[PDB]
């Protein structure tokens, strides 16, 4: 019913945020709504993470429409200030994208969370 849907429970967010920080260290993370759109258009995204407290929430509802059309899992997180923390950038981030790389060192963790997101969806 709410526009921000599905939005992860507490335990899932830490698993999500843990992957984001690892992806940031490994240069596999794209941060910000505009980059996420580009990755979806390129078909290079494993999945999309988004903030449900964005003010207004509306400015990031274009991404799920793109995500579904490419069959890309997506999920919201309650806090944007917390999402920026995981990304490693000095500022809040409302949307982030994990770039696809089957040769990455964190492939198992990315697919682990990715499976949970689909079950949520």
């Amino acid at each position: 019913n709410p526009k921000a849907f599905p939005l992860a429970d507490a335990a899932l967010t830490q698993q999500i945020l843990d992957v984001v920080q690892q992806a940031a260290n490994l240069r596999q993370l794209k941060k910000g709504a505009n980059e996420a759109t580009k990755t979806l258009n390129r078909g290079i995204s494993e999945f999309i993470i988004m903030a449900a407290d964005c003010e207004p929430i509306e400015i990031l509802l274009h991404l799920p429409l793109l995500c579904e059309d490419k069959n890309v899992p997506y999920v919201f997180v309650p806090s944007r200030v917390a999402l920026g923390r995981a990304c490693g950038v000095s500022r809040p981030v409302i949307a982030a994208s994990i770039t696809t790389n089957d040769a990455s060192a964190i492939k198992t963790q990315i697919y682990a969370v990715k499976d949970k997101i689909e079950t949520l969806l």
Binding site: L26, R27, A103, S104, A105, T108
Partner: protein, 181 residues
């Protein structure tokens, strides 16, 4: 005289080394993981064969047998500690599903390549053999070093390395001295 001390071979020649299938598999594996020769692939195959023969012998035995429970649990523990076996697959059946490629993945060379410290597998081998890589506080100069899950996060440039914060190498300071002169 002093008591004998034991030694063993870490590899075995394959049954038929001239099968084209084996040759092309070895080509792919060496190219992907930058292996110097086939003795490394034979070593990994020997280790995997020993592990999988043990796992098969365990799976023969009745479930709840003391020997099966104990030594199978030990094998799963060792495999997960090395990182080959995932945490969610802690069963001997998945041990029988293991492969050489995963042990090759756990090699230090592959990890220095993957983490981004090196731009290629061969560049990673050069860096490791060259004394530029440190796991934790220890310098490791061996590409075949098998890294653990905890040790994976500690791979970095050595403090003594020029890339890690030490002074420039001989070439750099030689060129600088010539430029100043």
């Amino acid at each position: 005289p002093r008591a004998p001390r034991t030694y063993s071979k870490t590899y075995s020649t394959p049954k038929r080394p001239y099968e084209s299938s084996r040759l092309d598999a070895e080509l792919k594996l060496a190219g992907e993981f930058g292996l110097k020769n086939k003795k490394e692939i034979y070593r990994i195959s020997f280790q995997l064969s020993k592990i999988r023969r043990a796992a098969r012998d365990l799976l023969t035995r009745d479930e709840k047998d003391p020997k099966r429970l104990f030594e199978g649990n030990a094998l799963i523990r060792r495999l997960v500690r090395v990182g080959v076996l995932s945490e969610d697959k802690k069963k001997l059946d998945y041990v029988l599903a293991l492969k050489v490629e995963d042990f090759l993945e756990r090699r230090l060379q592959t990890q220095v390549y993957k983490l981004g410290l090196a731009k290629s597998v061969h560049h990673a081998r050069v860096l490791i053999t060259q004394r530029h890589i440190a796991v934790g506080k220890q310098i490791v100069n061996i590409p075949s070093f098998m890294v653990r899950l905890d040790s994976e996060k500690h791979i970095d440039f050595a403090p003594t390395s020029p890339f890690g914060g030490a002074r420039p190498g001989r070439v750099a300071r030689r060129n600088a001295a010539r430029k100043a002169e």
